Structure 1
Amino acid sequence: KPWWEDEWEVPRETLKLVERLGAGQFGEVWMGYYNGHTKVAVKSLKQGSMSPDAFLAEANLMKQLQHQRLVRLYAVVTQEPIYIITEYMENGSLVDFLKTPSGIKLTINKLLDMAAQIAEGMAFIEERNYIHRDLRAANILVSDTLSCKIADFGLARLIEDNEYTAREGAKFPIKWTAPEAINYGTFTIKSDVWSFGILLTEIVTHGRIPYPGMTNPEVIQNLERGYRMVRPDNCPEELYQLMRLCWKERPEDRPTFDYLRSVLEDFFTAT
């Protein structure tokens, strides 16, 4: 739909950037205000750094996937510099939150709580025929009420025919990404279920890196033997067995996101 007609397009005067949160090869991420009053987060694309079309394909995807457990597109400014304006998450990224004095003191109870909200997010992604493909603590954001939401939809995709096969010179974080996706580039909701498994190790160890003290060739080599990640320090056995289902060998055997959600919900009231 054209920019002079798109419900999401906002004139650039409505926006005021107050505090750079991040900078990288492709642009900055700011905290600012929409029409004076509403905290928003603003992503600006660095001109020249990659295609406006590719940068905006992210917003368009978020036009289709709206949910309370997913970070909400708030508006776009489709003239240069292009802006993606989304809903603002106060406690920032999960990987970072878990490390702060506030996060340090959270009981295992609340960690299960949190792990359940992230699965609810995914159950809706799964249900609408989308995949995430980049599911990891660094991509869960946390709200001023200590609730969580799936963020970053740069790699997310719609999937009528069950699979998305990626480019072939194409690399993904080895520790978070399922065997089949690393080996064939074939992704399914079941490869996200795998990363969810890794993500639960981040939640429980307060953000520490998966597979403590192993390189990536050690990690691939170990998985091929039939090994899985060594039990995290202070990891309830239920949690660990739950991660094991996420780490099953065949995609089809790995559990649904609705099943994970509910399992995590039982783990939580039990505490």
Structure 2
Amino acid sequence: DAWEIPRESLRLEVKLGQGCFGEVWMGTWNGTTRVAIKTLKLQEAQVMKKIRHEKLVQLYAVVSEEPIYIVTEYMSKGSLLDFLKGEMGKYLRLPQLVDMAAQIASGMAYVERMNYVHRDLRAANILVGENLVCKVADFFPIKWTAPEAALYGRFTIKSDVWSFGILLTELTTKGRVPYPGMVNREVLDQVERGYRMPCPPECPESLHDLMCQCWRKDPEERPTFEYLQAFLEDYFTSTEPQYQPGENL
């Protein structure tokens, strides 16, 4: 396969993250190319190679023979989650946050067009680069999972939409865990009983509406990412043209 490079062309410099199955390292490829490298202790490619969009983290190369390595572009800001609760958090406002959201929706829209599913969409799985560039990446997270998928394993792009809705709460709360003061169990019970998170403080009701649309009980009622992208891209003109900066949003 033409993605295959030789291990030798990889210099694993700094370390970046630790996981259940392996690490992630800052690295150098062919001496001149800065890269991120995920490690193990090759099916995570069947579809990662076919994927190509400016808002999805780009694969660069693989090394199949164990230990399987993986080279992707480098995101200089780490996960959206760490970014949100980091020092940058306090400076981020609605416009910056709606723009990141839009970008993510854009990528998910591409996934949508390709008839793919993500299954685990959430801030932790979003990577940030220079100039607030956000890219979808790396595909139990019950609090992020649509009911039909959690209960009956009905995973679809529509359940991905659900997660997007939950992801919007992360952006608007600067990275707080959703359903505060609730454990996974009572989340299931409540959500199935129609409970939903309320409009976050300083968040415009129009944006909470969008969330609620994403959390509709019937997967088919949920908007497409194509709608979501367009909605957010246009947000401050067609939806909230009277937006005034607040203390946090």
TM-score normalised by L of structure 2: 0.92
2:60 is aligned, of 49, 74, 80, to 74
1:137 is aligned, of 116, 123, 130, to 123
SS of match in other structure, 2:132: coil
Return the alpha-carbon distance in structure 2 between the equivalents of residues 24 and 141 of structure 1: 16
Q: Deviations over 1:90-129 (max 9, x none)?
A: 1010000112222320121010001000000000101101
2:247 equivalent in structure 1: none
2:96 is aligned, of 110, 115, 125, to 110
2:20 equivalent in structure 1: 25
Return the alpha-carbon distance in structure 2 between the equivalents of residues 24 and 242 of structure 1: 33
What is the one-letter code of the residue matched to 1:243? M
SS of match in other structure, 1:40: strand
Say whether 1:9 aligns with 2:8.
no
Cα offset, 1:60, TM superposition: 2.4
Say whether 1:120 aligns with 2:115.
no
In structure 2, the gaps of 5 or more residues are 244-249
Return the alpha-carbon distance in structure 1 between the equivalents of residues 119 and 137 of structure 2: 12
SS of match in other structure, 1:131: coil
Q: Deviations over 1:188-209 (max 9, x none)?
A: 1100000000000001101000
Return the alpha-carbon distance in structure 1 between the equivalents of residues 15 and 167 of structure 2: 27
SS of match in other structure, 2:60: strand
What is the one-letter code of the residue matched to 1:250? D
1:207 is aligned, of 155, 175, 185, to 175
Cα offset, 1:22, TM superposition: 1.5
Return the alpha-carbon distance in structure 2 between the equivalents of residues 221 and 40 of structure 1: 43
Residues 38-49 of structure 1 mapped to structure 2, 5 A cutoff: 38-46=33-41
Cα offset, 1:214, TM superposition: 1.1
SS of match in other structure, 2:217: coil
Return the alpha-carbon distance in structure 1 between the equivalents of residues 198 and 181 of structure 2: 11
Percent of aligned pairs with the same amino acid: 65
Residues 1-271 of structure 1 mapped to structure 2, 5 A cutoff: 6-46=1-41, 56-153=42-139, 172-269=140-237, 270=241
SS of match in other structure, 1:98: helix
In structure 1, the gaps of 5 or more residues are 1-5, 47-55, 154-171
What is the one-letter code of the residue matched to 2:88? S
Q: Deviations over 1:149-208 (max 9, x none)?
A: 11002xxxxxxxxxxxxxxxxxx3111000101111111110000000000000110100
Is the 1:211–1:230 Cα contact (8 Å) retained in structure 2?
no
SS of match in other structure, 1:130: coil
Return the alpha-carbon distance in structure 2 between the equivalents of residues 259 and 112 of structure 1: 14
